[PDB]
Amino acid sequence: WLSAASFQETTRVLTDAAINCRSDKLNGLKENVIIGKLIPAGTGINRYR
Amino acid sequence: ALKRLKVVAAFQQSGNSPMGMVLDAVPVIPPELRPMVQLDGGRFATSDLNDLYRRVINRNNRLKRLIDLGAPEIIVNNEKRMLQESVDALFDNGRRGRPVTGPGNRPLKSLSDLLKGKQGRFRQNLLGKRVDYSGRSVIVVGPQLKL
Amino acid sequence: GEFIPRPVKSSFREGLTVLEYFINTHGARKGLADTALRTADSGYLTRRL
Amino acid sequence: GAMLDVNFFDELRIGLATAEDIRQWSYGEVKKPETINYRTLKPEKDGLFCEKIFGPTRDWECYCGKYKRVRFKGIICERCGVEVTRAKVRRERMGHIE
Amino acid sequence: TGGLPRVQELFEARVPRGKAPIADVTGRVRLEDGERFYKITIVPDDGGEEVVYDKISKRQRLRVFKRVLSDGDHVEVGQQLMEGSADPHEV
Amino acid sequence: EEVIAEHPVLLNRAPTLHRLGIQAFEPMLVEGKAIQLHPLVCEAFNADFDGDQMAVHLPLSAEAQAEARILMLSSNNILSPASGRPLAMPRLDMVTG
Amino acid sequence: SSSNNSVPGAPNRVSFAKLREPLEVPGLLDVQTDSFEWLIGSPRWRESAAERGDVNPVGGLEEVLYELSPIEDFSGSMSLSFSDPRFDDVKAPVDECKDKDMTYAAPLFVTAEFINNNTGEIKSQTVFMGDFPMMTEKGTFIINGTERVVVSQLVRSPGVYFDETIDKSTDKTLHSVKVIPSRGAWLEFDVDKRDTVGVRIDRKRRQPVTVLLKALGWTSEQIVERFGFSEIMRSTLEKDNTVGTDEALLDIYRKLRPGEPPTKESAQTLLENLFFKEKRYDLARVGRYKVNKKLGLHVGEPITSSTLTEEDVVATIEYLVRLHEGQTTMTVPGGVEVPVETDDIDHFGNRRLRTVGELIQNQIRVGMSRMERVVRERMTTQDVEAITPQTLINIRPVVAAIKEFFGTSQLSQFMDQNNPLSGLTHKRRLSALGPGGLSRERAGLEVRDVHPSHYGRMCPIETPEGPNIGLIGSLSVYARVNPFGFIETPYRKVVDGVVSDEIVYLTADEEDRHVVAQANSPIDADGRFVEPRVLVRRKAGEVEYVPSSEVDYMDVSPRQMVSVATAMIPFLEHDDANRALMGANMQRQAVPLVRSEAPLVGTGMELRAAIDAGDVVVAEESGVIEEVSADYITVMHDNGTRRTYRMRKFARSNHGTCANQCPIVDAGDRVEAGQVIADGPCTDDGEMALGKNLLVAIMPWEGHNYEDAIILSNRLVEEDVLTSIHIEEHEIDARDTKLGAEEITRDIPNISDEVLADLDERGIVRIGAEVRDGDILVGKVTPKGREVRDTSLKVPHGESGKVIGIRVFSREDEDELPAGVNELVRVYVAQKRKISDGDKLAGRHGNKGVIGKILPVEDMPFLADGTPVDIILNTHGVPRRMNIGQILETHLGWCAHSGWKVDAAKGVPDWAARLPDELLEAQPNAIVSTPVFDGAQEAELQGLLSCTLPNRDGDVLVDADGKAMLFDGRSGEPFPYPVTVGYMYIMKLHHLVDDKIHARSTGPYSMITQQPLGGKAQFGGQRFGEMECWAMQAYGAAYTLQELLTIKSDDTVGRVKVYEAIVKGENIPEPGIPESFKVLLKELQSLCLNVEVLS
DNA sequence: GAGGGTATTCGCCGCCTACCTCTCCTAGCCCGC
DNA sequence: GCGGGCTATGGCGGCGAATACCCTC
RNA sequence: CGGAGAGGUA
Ligand SMILES: [Mg+2]
Ligand SMILES: [Zn+2]
């Protein structure tokens, strides 16, 4: 619900997510960029980092 | 029934009552995130959020006085409607009815406007930043350089 | 978008007359307008992709 | 789960807020439509900028002036009621309107 | 459409524009000629049932597959009868 | 002159349509107030010299410098990721000569 | 042969033109100057209208007053009226206002008479209506000491328009009509896809037309009497399902005023008040004229109405019903014949021009309406026999409206003062975007087009290049605006196949019913075309070969469609439209050079352009110069009177350039009225001079002029050929402050006297001092509660120069200061800028580029005689961009500089047969002119290149092809092949590299989102956007991206720790949590959403 | 008059990036000094 | 009498949902 | 350095 709210239609996404009580398992490029964490790709994968 | 069941199952599966749609209290954002500045000389120009909070507070206090002192049902109902409208405009100004406009006939920036659009929080502050150790200048061709 | 059946009959070495220049300005400007519209249109598609 | 934050994030959850949650977030109530005074250039009380709700406006100081040093750390003012802490607290604390 | 709008509608999986019907079962067709409407009936080789489209406007041409589409001609399962762009959701 | 030795720099031109819009070079001080761009990276940057401008970034930490030196160095990026054709190829005056 | 034989003291610039100009170019500021004297009703406008509009000469203010008055109460027992507006002398001269800060305005008075309708007592007074901003002689307004230009607005003329569309479902051609009023309510009449004519009064339900037809008083008898020949008209009543006059009225009320008693009287009031009274509906004079012209109602009675009428509203229906069918003619009863047809909404007959006068009139009108409401309110709450005109009038709304228009409008624009041409071009702009026009994004590609109706009224070339493409235009050269706002262009009447005199001004609407010919057409002074066929714009701008007996008019000159700036490009017809647009726009960006020099290959539109711009000084009256100095000229008139002109030296323009006037006459010369007596910023002998003549080569060179880069010699720097002066303006004031009182003085604590060496007794720096980046210009201290806090003015980063002037306004000297201040000290610093690497240059043909390198003058290609070239331009840029005009300009510039002599020993050569005398021979450094579309042919250029004079010895350095044999200054060997050389005209654009260089490591930060600030003026940092993030993610570089987004931008502790680590030899710490995520969390919580982070 | 099937119209959502310069943020009116 | 503070009918395409018009029971 | 409007460069 955090990657969809930054793309389009923030109000609708937020209001539906709040009703469905969705939990965000932060795993993605955009989400890790937003929360200031190493992206899971390239030199940020476990075998490399 | 498909859409009705969508919403009803959404509210049934989790321990989330549908009573959160009707509000009894209204949170207030911290002041340093809605600051008020002064133009040249020392004259303060109000922010949009402060004006909407002020309207809601005024309406709430006046309705409270009217109810406490006792009054005909019409006045109390009218004031409750005017409080409902103010609270609606606080969260989302312009969704229903005429936008609450400030000086110069321009709609105010509600709390919802902070999150939406190309100038909203996300696409202006979280997906892009202003970074130190950077500069800018015009480019010219150096033929003696190496790749 | 239709062709002018005249047509323009002088090269830019010789020098176009006044009417030839005026009827050339049409296509000259339509291209720039379309270019602005297209640069506006492409970024949205790239972001969606 | 983690209050402010601090890394080792695992999930970010969202949901509707009940009146109890909204009253628990708030450090006080706003019940006067006054933002700031012009003569003293200070926030009013029970307004939208109150220092007894959102936090001190000067590091380790009180609107009373009773305590204006770090030695008076953590004590809630006995005269004005403003807690003595750093001014950054105004970016965090919230209030509510009943 | 033949440019960036065409790309946008391809990636958006929208109904194209000049949507051309596509057969759903191999069989011959009793092509009919009329103004503002063309009746194309799918006569399957098995003969179970015959699908038909009579709303085809005369403006659009008939696709040339294998000779132009003609009366009483067998067609494949996915052959596009008319000319234009097929709708992705039907293929 | 000693401090800036062997310290890569990131140059960027807007719009950044593709990946090669940011590349890492090595700084050598010159005379003037303009940036001197190697002629073979213009196609990658889609840049010209009729008034264009560019930004400059400096990676600080060891990981950032290693990334600049190995991943983003200009001499290691000669082929287009989209198609594989070379992009540091000679053009215009070089082709004529 | 010469260019300007009318101006008394003009240079003898010879021309290649072959065609005579019947008419002289009008004044280039007449629109702005005339539309305002119409507003104030000056005697000059009255005289102008006498020989034209003597029937009813009324000014804007008079018209507004007459329309407003009389103001009477409901009972009609009293009245108030206005008349005879009057202006007094301006309070201060233009220079005084521009210096102090006052607005250039004069008092306005009106005679107000109050009449009591039951006692007969009449009381009259002269009521002051406020200060009225006045227009300077140059067409500008000084508002708060700043010059401004009120741009003209293109808008859609009010009237009735019919349009056509194709129905997708049934392929039926649905029609429509819309009555567009001024300040009124809309009224549509559609034909939908069921053959049911309907109405959409305002934005209500689609009521059938028969509803309103009957409600107006008609019956089925009359409805079928006039309507009925259309099947749909009768079918409308057949299936109306409603009938009755009162029934119809109550239906209209049900659709108009929901929720109130539907009474017949109330419906009458509502309807005939919305659409017929006087004040809710105003078609206006232009709207009434257009409606009468379209619906063929009257061709007689002078327009004396501004309201709708039954005949018009029924003629609209008749027109629509006839239109839908196939009819192509109608004659409404008691009306002249008129065809049936749709209306093109882009035509220049269907869109008029709102000039400065009309806009100001509209604003005054709204202010007067507010005042009228106030006066009517107060006219019933005050006792009789105590009311006087002064006791009811409140001027506040009018002054407020004037202030708001002149300060907060999209048409009142800051004037452009880069050079003389930019301001003149600004004063002649036509914009479509404004309060009442299109939108910069919602506007389509059909309003950004070149319409055939624009030929001779709007220039098709000079438009912006970005989002405003097609929305801002420029008025043409010979064009004028008529009383109703429709632009007219001159034409030369041709009679019986003879191109005669007596120019007549036409409009687009009128011009659409004639055939006009091309100006550059063959005529033989006998009124008979030499050639058989001539291209002519047939009806809809369709150029066609046509018989010579059909032509009805002729263009005045072959220079009629272009604007002023586009008319200064020589060999314009050899350049493509894109590059011509680039060059026309770039001519307005050139900076004034320290010394100006006129071109050698100009066009001719440079003397009038300079004189009309008004930056030169023109002698008021003829006389003999008495004493001429650098600061003042004194003409001793022919009647014993002396008038001393004062020259403004080293002044500052709105854009930081330097304005400097220099006399060009001697102490014994005799001058004539209208003669140029001094020069301006970009003028040389009274002609525009925006650049310099340089010797150019057209070869590639070592890859330094690669991809539009340029190579310059070092002579242009040593000799100051392209040097310019710029001026900055630093201002600081001392307020009263809540703290209380602040002073400017040398007493700055903690600073030694050494730093304050350049400071003086008062506090300001000494004139003639040198200031560098960081230096006290005005030393002060403010007690922030000693508490004295030094907030002294400093030289901005990257600034330097010399302090050349200081202005200080003191409250003690009863100055016109703002509220709450005491001092307004101001400073000026000026510095000369030489051409450097990174500066932008360009010609007049869209050939732009930055300076790649500045070679030493030793290793430069030099001619056989030893003369180095000045500039080198690459070969690969020309043939691709279709701007070959620069090469022809170079050839002709070489011919002009070298001087020539055609050898007509035995007859003039056939290539010089049509070459005017005085052009068969020239001396070195001769100045010539090639008009924009009628100039030098290629054969003439070849011939002139074939015969040029030797330099000192009998050597011709450039051969017939125009190419010389150069030498390699870097190696010494001669280049294997010859090169093209010559003189072209180069300008220095206002895009210097000193203004575009910026760097940062740390500094000011934002407060809410704790990120660096944006801008070169508060240090600020470059922004790492979203596509750069995509690129960094595609590289697979996680750590650089993380550091960029965390420790360089908004990680408060991280920034300080990183700085402390780098300054020392430590290693960079780990990044933390950004600061823009916590703000988002708080906002989401404030929206009543329980957001939490779960471990 | 309710049902089910069509049409029809209205509201909302979306519409590239980076940088530079310049001017202005209510009106009325009631109380206080 | 003047100043300061308090209050009160020139986008357009896609799409879905809230609702006109007509045959059936 | 917060907002609105105007103009401009790539
Ligand atoms: Mg460029
Ligand atoms: Zn206290």
Automatic annotation (TrEMBL), chain E:
General function of this protein: DNA-dependent RNA polymerase catalyzes the transcription of DNA into RNA using the four ribonucleoside triphosphates as substrates.
Protein family per UniProt: Belongs to the RNA polymerase beta' chain family.
Subunit structure comment from the entry: The RNAP catalytic core consists of 2 alpha, 1 beta, 1 beta' and 1 omega subunit. When a sigma factor is associated with the core the holoenzyme is formed, which can initiate transcription.
Protein name: DNA-directed RNA polymerase subunit beta'
Upper lineage: Bacteria, Bacillati, Actinomycetota, Actinomycetes, Mycobacteriales
